[model samples]
Structure formats: structure tokens, C-alpha cells
Target: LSPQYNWVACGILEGGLKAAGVLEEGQYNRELAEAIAAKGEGFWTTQFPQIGDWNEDQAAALADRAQTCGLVKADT
Candidate 1:
């Protein structure tokens, strides 16, 4: 196994879900969901950072970002 970024890999990919509304917001956006769900081409990156980055503040930011990006939809 090589840990080098030598060769390029090609494949189809699915981005993610874009939800309408969130825990903090009540309104829903269908267009945003469709836009976010649209597929694109580029390098694939995983979002698994180090465990140390999961602090309270970071967690809050992550949650906020998710909410803003329409990644999570919930009513509260």
C-alpha cells in the first residue's frame, strides 16, 4: 500500500443531503436542498479530523455550520 498521492482515482460520487429548516430555524428551502444534493467533480476528501478537534467550541461551530449549510434539518 502506498500513502502517496501519485495516481488519480476516477469514480462517480454523491455529495450529501441538504435539508430545509433546522433546529434553530423554522422555514424550509427546497431549492437549497436540490442545489446541495447536486453532484460535482473534484478530488474526494474525507472530513474526519483528529479527535482533539472535537472540543466544545469546535463542536458548536460544526453544528452551526451544518445548520447553516442545510445539512441538518430539525424542528425545535
Candidate 2:
């Protein structure tokens, strides 16, 4: 899988935290992507990041983004 898989996963979590006011809003630009990537790398090395396989988590993150960005329809 592409390296973006990791970034996207972290981005989803970052996005959720930001929405919840747990994190300050950052620019929606390359810097944000970099931050996500860095965070993802750190998480990957942690003992407990997610409960399932990393690839599956990344795919789930991508799926969520696809719907949120309107690339796919939401479930009825």
C-alpha cells in the first residue's frame, strides 16, 4: 500500500480530535499532511495504536474520507 495510507489514517484521527476541540485547527495544506504522516509514524511504533491490523485501519480511514469528501455516497 502507498505511504498515504498511514497519513490518511492519522489524519482521520486528527480530524476527529480537532472537531472535538482536543486539538487546535491547523492549515488544510501540505503542513497538515506532514504532521499527520509524522504522527502516524509515531503511532505505528507504539504498542497499542489500533485494535486491528494496520492495513485494515488505513482502509477504513480511506473509506471514511471518501464519504466525507463526497467521493462516495453515505449509507442510507
Model 1 C-alpha lDDT per residue in residues 29-62, reported as the tens digit of each score: 4323333333221232124334333333343444
Q: Could you tell me the TM-score of candidate 2?
A: 0.30
Regions of model 1 farther than 4 Å from truth: 1-54
Collision pairs in model 2: none
lDDT of 1: 0.33
Candidate 2: worst-modelled 10 consecutive residues by lDDT: 25-34
Across 1-76, the per-residue lDDT of candidate 2 in tens digits comes to: 6654466665675577456433343333333333334455545445554633563455445445534443334444
Which portions of model 2 miss their true places by more than 4 Å? 1-52
